[PDB]
Design brief:
homodimer; about 50% strand; Spindle assembly abnormal protein 6 (chain B); structural protein; beta-sandwich
Chain lengths: ~140, ~140
């Protein structure tokens, strides 16, 4: 309705997850993941929201999302030293990184949440852009 | 004697100092060298900052592998101790005669933070910061 799709593509990501509840060591696989980025209006406040949704074509049980408003974004920008404002944020990652880039998806052992992480390698670092905690769509 | 110069250039830096900061663009000489610690024999990386006009402006820090590991941990560096100087010299300090250098002074000028940046479309792009001490 108010929802505007900004990005909807299948990406190659590394999916990481603990071996079990008691074994925190990760197992890692390269998997194809659908990433959807959209903007929408919060129904109670009318303010702009940025929604991130991750799914898989094979695994219907794999559904994670997070909606960011300007306040939530400021926390993210603060934690990852982002300079870009809330409105410019989606445009930059879409035009410069999502279109060398690495995506990591780290699952909870209970699969209640997953950390969506984006990287742009430098000659001296992994070049982490940001990580977003996405929650299971339940 | 054991000292080997890896870098010796005049760079443009922003000198910041305190309650709030005042900032000026200043020319600073940066010297990077490798040397042998006299007591241990281990390799050391030395960073020295000076100015031609201000003789009182003298700051240095010597990093060994252990000290470097702390720096790499604090700034998510992937490059090893031996490759570190080459990477910064060849990719970031080569273009300075989107690289920016900040030098942040102590109010008492006992120490200064030497910070290196490579701007990205989403961030300032801090590479690292080294606390240098007054010589």
């Amino acid at each position: 309705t108010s929802k505007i799709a900004l990005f909807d593509q299948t990406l190659i990501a590394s999916l990481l997850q603990p071996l079990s509840l008691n074994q925190p060591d990760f197992k890692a696989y390269k998997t194809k993941v659908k990433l959807k980025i959209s903007e929408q209006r919060n129904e109670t406040s009318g303010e702009k929201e940025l929604k991130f949704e991750i799914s898989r074509s094979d695994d219907f049980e794999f559904l994670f999302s997070e909606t960011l408003n300007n306040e939530k974004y400021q926390i993210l920008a603060r934690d990852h030293d982002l300079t870009v404002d809330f409105d410019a944020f989606p445009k930059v990652i879409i035009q410069h990184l999502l279109c060398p880039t690495e995506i990591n998806i780290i699952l909870d052992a209970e699969k209640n949440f997953c950390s969506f992480e984006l990287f742009s390698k430098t000659p001296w670092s992994k070049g982490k852009i940001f990580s977003i905690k996405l929650h299971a769509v339940r």
